[PDB]
Paper text:
Francisella virulence arises from a 33 kilobase (Kb) pathogenicity island (FPI) that is regulated by the macrophage locus protein A ([name]) and the stringent starvation protein A (SspA). These proteins interact with both RNA polymerase (RNAP) and the pathogenicity island gene regulator (PigR) to activate FPI transcription. Indeed, while most bacterial SspA proteins function as homodimers to activate transcription, [name] SspA forms a heterodimer with the [name] protein, which is unique to [name]. Thus, our structure unveils [name] as a new member of the SspA subclass of GST proteins.
To gain insight into the function of the [name] [name] protein we determined its structure by multiple wavelength anomalous diffraction (MAD). The crystal contains two molecules of [name] in the asymmetric unit (ASU), which form a dimer. The structure was refined to final Rwork and Rfree values of 17.3% and 22.8%, respectively to 2.95 Å resolution. Each [name] subunit harbors four β strands and 8 α helices. [name] homodimerization is primarily electrostatic and is mediated by 14 salt bridges formed between residues on α4 and α5. Specifically, Arg64, Lys87, Arg89, and Arg93 interact with Asp59', Glu70', Asp74' and Glu97', respectively (where ' indicates the other subunit in the dimer). Indeed, similar to what is observed in SspA proteins, [name] dimerization is largely mediated by contacts between one region from each subunit. This leads to the creation of a V shaped morphology in the [name] dimer, whereby the tightly interacting regions of the dimer combine to create a compact surface (“compact face”) while the opposite side of the dimer harbors a large and exposed cavity (“open face”). Thus, the combined SEC and crosslinking data demonstrate that while [name] appears to preferentially heterodimerize with SspA, it can form weak homodimers in solution. Finally, the [name] structure revealed malate, which was used in crystallization, bound in an open pocket formed by the dimer, suggesting the possibility that this cleft could function in small molecule ligand binding. The relatively low resolution of the structure makes the precise docking of the malate molecules into the density ambiguous and isothermal titration calorimetry experiments revealed no binding suggesting that the observed protein-malate interactions likely occur only at the high malate concentrations (2.1 M) used for crystallization.
Residue numbers in the entry:
A (entry chain B): 0 to 143, 152 to 205
B (entry chain A): 0 to 147, 152 to 203
Amino acid sequence: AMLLYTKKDDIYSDIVRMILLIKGANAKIVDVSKEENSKHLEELNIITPNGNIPTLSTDDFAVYRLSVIIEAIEDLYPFPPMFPVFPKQRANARILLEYVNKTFLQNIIKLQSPDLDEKQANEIKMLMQRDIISTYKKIVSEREAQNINVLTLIITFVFYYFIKLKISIPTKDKNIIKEIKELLSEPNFIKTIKAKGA
Amino acid sequence: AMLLYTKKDDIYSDIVRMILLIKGANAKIVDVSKEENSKHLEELNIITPNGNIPTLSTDDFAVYRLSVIIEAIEDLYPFPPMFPVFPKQRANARILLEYVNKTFLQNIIKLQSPDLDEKQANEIKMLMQRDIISTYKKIVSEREVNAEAQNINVLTLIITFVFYYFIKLKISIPTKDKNIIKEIKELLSEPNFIKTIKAK
């Protein structure tokens, strides 16, 4: 019924795949890195300007902005909730999602590209280290057994890509490290991480 | 008690002000570009990262992305509904709204930029002109496919402002179809639209 176009190590794809896993959604997931799916790649380029990844296409429409991929999924698949149920927290959450998107996710992708001036990269990593603890801190504050939230899920993926890019979390706090280790341990997260593009 | 930080000739501000108009919410609009509201501007610069415009301010929060603004306004004034109320339809509508946002709204803001290059001004105009009519048709098709038409949706309101701004930026509306012309004129002379553009 539903189609998700993905790439093997895209934090965005990983996020949308986890969200689809947690929801009861069943969607065909296609990795356009693989030749075996070249047809799908061709199609992707037709239905989006740059053949963006990830793209979620219902039969009707196709979307590549993360925020509205998440929104569309949340409308099609209401349960379980990815967002707060009350307008203040829900709105502030939406702003936060946009913030994490600007600061960490986009930058993680920027880091993946090999054209980048090494020093330039080093800046980006450094900024990320600068804001990671504070961001994690707002996300826990907004959280105030509990359901997983879209912000916590995304931040789990952020910590996981920090690990991938050999970036070390700047905290001495014991509890924070226990918490981050605890996030990285969720079953769906690992389930998603094990199967790279699907 | 709402407070909408706007600036003049901003398509987003106008869209939102009409949203509030329609919702019947009474909100204090503030033109941040105006000198007499400089204090307000200062305040905005505290509660927002980059002096974001528009920004809606409630007793509880401030929000600034258009999707997020329409969202909050709806949470606090759900009736009448801007989006469909059934999941599938509502989803398509959000996606289509994002499309109009990327293709049109954002590009209109681009064309207003004071440092605008001529090459990219032409790129943008040509892009928009090339797509506007098929986009408009997608909107009316989605409209009439399942619904059902007394009250208006966000897609139609926004496409009305896109047309209005095509005019405001001296871009010819590329159609000769007499039906579509009639429809566009009907859109452009809808009560709340005129009430919105001529009371600023």
